[PDB]
């Protein structure tokens, strides 16, 4: 299972 | 500013997720998935409820929530 991956999106 | 999570999920069924605004173009986050992907950004659709996602669309004009799905299939002719 892969892990969880969160990316956060500047603005 | 107001955040989301959205879930994007791959021919593969991998799945990463997105935090952005409401107001976020979602260019940013085609570019970003298609970067974690190795892929050109143009050899990609991405869908929200089978719809193409523009460039220049947004959370709000799409009517997205926290934990929407967007799927991510082959530009086409290619089924």
Not at chain 1, 1 to 11: G, P
Not at chain 2, 59 to 71: F, N, Q, S, T, W
């Amino acid at each position: 299972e892969a892990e969880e991956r969160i990316i956060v999106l500047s603005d | 500013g107001e955040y989301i999570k959205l879930k994007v999920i791959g021919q593969d069924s991998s799945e990463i997720h997105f935090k952005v605004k409401m107001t976020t173009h979602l260019k940013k986050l085609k570019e970003s998935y298609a970067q974690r992907q190795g892929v050109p950004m143009n050899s990609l659709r991405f869908l929200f409820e089978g719809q193409r996602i523009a460039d220049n669309h947004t959370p709000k004009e799409l009517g997205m929530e926290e934990e929407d799905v967007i799927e991510v299939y082959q530009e086409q002719t290619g089924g």
